[PDB]
Amino acid sequence: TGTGLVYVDAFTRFHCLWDASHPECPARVSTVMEMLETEGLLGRCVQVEARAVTEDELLLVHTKEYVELMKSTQNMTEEELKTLAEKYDSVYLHPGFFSSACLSVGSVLQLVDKVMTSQLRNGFSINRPPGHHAQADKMNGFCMFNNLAIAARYAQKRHRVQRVLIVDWDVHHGQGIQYIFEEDPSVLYFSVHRYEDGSFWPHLKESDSSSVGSGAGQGYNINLPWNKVGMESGDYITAFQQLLLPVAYEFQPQLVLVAAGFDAVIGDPKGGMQVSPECFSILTHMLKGVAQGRLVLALEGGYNLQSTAEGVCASMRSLLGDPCPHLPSSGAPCESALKSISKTISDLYPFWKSLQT
Numbered sequence: 001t002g003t004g005l006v007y008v009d010a011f012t013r014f015h016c017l018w019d020a021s022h023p024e025c026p027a028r029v030s031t032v033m034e035m036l037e038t039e040g041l042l043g044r045c046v047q048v049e050a051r052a053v054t055e056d057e058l059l060l061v062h063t064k065e066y067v068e069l070m071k072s073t074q075n076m077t078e079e080e081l082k083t084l085a086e087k088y089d090s091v092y093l094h095p096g097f098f099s100s101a102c103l104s105v106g107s108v109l110q111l112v113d114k115v116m117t118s119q120l121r122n123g124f125s126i127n128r129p130p131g132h133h134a135q136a137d138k139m140n141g142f143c144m145f146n147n148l149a150i151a152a153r154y155a156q157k158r159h160r161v162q163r164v165l166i167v168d169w170d171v172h173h174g175q176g177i178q179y180i181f182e183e184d185p186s187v188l189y190f191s192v193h194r195y196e197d198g199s200f201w202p203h204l205k206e207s208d209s210s211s212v213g214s215g216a217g218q219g220y221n222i223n224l225p226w227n228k229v230g231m232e233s234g235d236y237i238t239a240f241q242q243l244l245l246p247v248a249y250e251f252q253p254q255l256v257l258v259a260a261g262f263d264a265v266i267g268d269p270k271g272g273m274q275v276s277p278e279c280f281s282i283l284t285h286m287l288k289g290v291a292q293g294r295l296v297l298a299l300e301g302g303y304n305l306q307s308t309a310e311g312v313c314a315s316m317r318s319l320l321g322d323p324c325p326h327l328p329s330s331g332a333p334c335e336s337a338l339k340s341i342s343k344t345i346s347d348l349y350p351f352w353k354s355l356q357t
C-alpha cells in the first residue's frame with residue numbers, strides 16, 4: 001500500500017579508526033535521513049524495523065569460514081583489525097562493523113518480506129555498510145556482506161520467487177554481485193559503471209561488457225561500462241530505455257532490487273559523472289513498470305553528503321508516486337555513451353529478442 005523505509009542508528013556505529021576523514025562514514029546516512037525529514041518525505045513512508053541477518057541467511061551467499069571470521073572482528077584491537085583489513089582491497093575494520101553489517105543485510109530482507117507479501121508497494125533501506133562488492137569469502141570495497149545478493153536468494157527461497165532483477169546504478173561495478181550469480185540465469189544482474197578500460201576501481205577485465213555470464217548464466221549478466229567521464233541524465237535515461245528496460249520486460253522478474261549508490265551524481269568527489277539527482281526519479285519511475293512495482297532500493301556508495309541525500313530524495317519521491325520532475329539536462333545522449341550502449345547491446349544481442357533491431 002505504501003513505501004517502506006528502514007533506518008537504524010546502528011548504521012552510524014562504525015567508522016575508520018585510523019582516518020577521521022574516511023569517505024565511507026556515519027554522516028552519509030545521517031545526512032540522508034536529515035534531508036528526507038526536511039523534505040517531508042520521511043513522514044510519508046511506512047517505518048519498517050530492521051532485523052539482524054541470521055547465519056543461515058548469510059550462508060545463502062557467504063562461506064561458513066568467512067562468516068565466522070567476520071564475527072570474530074568484534075574482538076580485535078585497532079592494530080589487529082588493521083592486520084585483517086590490509087588483507088583486502090579498500091576496506092577498513094571497526095569493532096562494530098559486523099553488528100552493523102548484519103543489520104544492513106537484515107534491513108533489506110525486512111523490505112523484501114513486506115513487498116513480496118503485499119504489505120508495502122516498495123521500499124528503501126538507508127543502510128551502511130554497503131554490499132555490492134562483498135564476495136563469498138572476502139570483504140571488498142567498504143563491504144562486508146553482499147546485502148542484495150543475500151536478499152535475492154532469500155526472496156527465491158522464502159517467497160518462492162523464481163526470477164530476480166538486480167539493477168546497479170552505483171558508479172562502481174558491483175563485481176561481487178556479478179560473481180555470485182555469474183552462472184545463474186534466475187538472477188539477472190545489470191550494472192552501469194565508470195570503467196575507462198580498467199583504470200577506474202575495481203580495475204577488472206570482468207567489468208567490461210564482454211562478461212555476459214557463464215554456462216547457464218550466459219546473457220544474464222549485463223555490464224554497461226563508461227569509458228569517458230561526465231556522463232549525464234540523458235546517457236543514463238538512454239541506457240535504461242534502449243538496453244535495461246527492454247531486457248527487463250523480456251526477463252519478467254518478480255522482484256527488482258536496486259544497488260542504489262549515488263556516486264554518479266553531480267558533485268561526488270570521486271565518481272566523476274554529471275548525473276543530476278532528478279535523474280534518479282526517472283530511473284526509479286521506469287523500474288516501477290516491472291514486477292508489479294515490487295521494488296526494493298538499498299544504499300550502496302555515494303560520498304558527497306548533499307548529492308547523495310538529494311539522489312535518495314529523488315528516488316524516494318518516485319517510490320511515493322510523486323510526479324516526475326523536470327529534467328534540467330538534455331534528453332539526448334552523447335556519442336561515447338551511445339558507443340558503450342551499442343557495444344553492450346552487441347554483446348547481449350544473441351540472448352534477448354527485444355534487443356534485435
Ligand SMILES: CC(/C=C/C(=O)NO)=C\[C@@H](C)C(=O)c1ccc(N(C)C)cc1
Nearest residue numbers: 090091141142170172201261300301302
Ligand atoms: C572502494 C571505493 C569505492 C567504493 C564504492 O563507492 N563502491 O560503490 C573507493 C576506493 C578506491 C577509495 O577511494 C579508497 C580510499 C581509501 C583507501 N584506503 C587508504 C584503504 C582505499 C580506497
Ligand SMILES: [K+]
Nearest residue numbers: 168170172192
Ligand atoms: K554499478
Ligand SMILES: [K+]
Nearest residue numbers: 181184187220
Ligand atoms: K546472472
Ligand SMILES: [Zn+2]
Nearest residue numbers: 170171172301
Ligand atoms: Zn560506488
